[PDB]
């Protein structure tokens, strides 16, 4: 079931990139798998550079952890930063040098939808604290697809919007009081946005929460370890109920507990 985050486990390393192209990146599974994929299917994008187009796909967890990809997709336009997600058969990613979110259907390699996130800063305006052009961060939780960003009107505070996964329309929007560039990353669990304090520390914390159901903001002190000292991506998977992260070449996962 659902609840408030109360604990994060130790990071477990599932795969380590062998080249500088994977110093930062995004890896993910689909919380709503659709044919021909399953809950084991894994995608990995090494995101260093300026023409990021290769998406590595692995049918099996064993292949993700020990082998070569089973398929490589070449995106039709370059991707920006580490914020992408996979949801219900599509990769949702941000176009390079844009505030455009793109829905790319993985089995057909068809762009099904594109949407400018209204007012969103991009390309170094409202990144997380490490930089990396992390202005726009997609998220999946128990209720579906969201996007995390900021705007000039919000003065750089985290804004989050629920997204229609079919056509990318914004369905509802909330404004927090958390400066986006003051936190290392963020993710959503059960409709509550959580932030991480530091991308370098072994003794970081999950330090803020904003509950979209109640409008209430809280401070937290839940320990969070950046084992390799440079976490570029931290997302939540609601099917596995785990955090997925990318830390200085390493694809890692953290158990959690909800109350
Ligand atoms: Ca995130
Ligand atoms: Na994301």
Author numbering: 244 to 502
What does the paper say about this structure?
Inherited missense mutations in the myocilin (MYOC) gene, within its olfactomedin (OLF) domain, constitute the strongest genetic link to primary open-angle glaucoma via a toxic gain of function, and thus MYOC is an attractive precision-medicine target. Myocilin has no known function, and there is no glaucoma phenotype in Myoc knockout mice or in individuals with a homozygous N-terminal truncation mutation or hemizygous deletion of MYOC, but rare non-synonymous coding mutations lead to toxic intracellular sequestration of misfolded myocilin. However, not all mutations in MYOC cause glaucoma, and common variants are expected to be neutral polymorphisms. Among the common features associated with pathogenic myocilin misfolding, we demonstrate that a single metric, OLF thermal stability, can robustly segregate benign from early-onset disease variants.
At the outset of our study, five variants could be confidently predicted as benign polymorphisms: T293K, T353I, K398R, A445V and K500R. These mutations are all found on the protein surface and well documented in the literature. Thr to Lys and Thr to Ile are less conservative changes, but in prior studies, T293K and T353I exhibited wild type (WT)-like cellular secretion and WT-like thermal stability, and were found in the control group for case–control clinical studies. Assessment of spent media from cells expressing each of the 16 full-length myocilin variants revealed WT-like secretion for T256M, R296H, L303I, S313F, V329M, S331L, T353I, A445V, V449I and K500R. The detergent-insoluble myocilin fractions were highest for E300K, S313F, T353I and N420Y. Indeed, in our cellular assay, some misfolding characteristics were initially detected for T353I and S313F but, ultimately, other characteristics including thermal stabilities were found to be within the bounds of benign variants. Structural integrity was further confirmed by high-resolution crystal structures, which were solved for 11 OLF variants. No gross changes from WT OLF were detected for the structures of T293K, R296H, L303I, V329M, S331L, E352K, T353I, K398R, A445V, V449I or K500R, indicating that these mutations are accommodated within the native five-bladed β-propeller fold and do not perturb the dinuclear calcium-containing site.
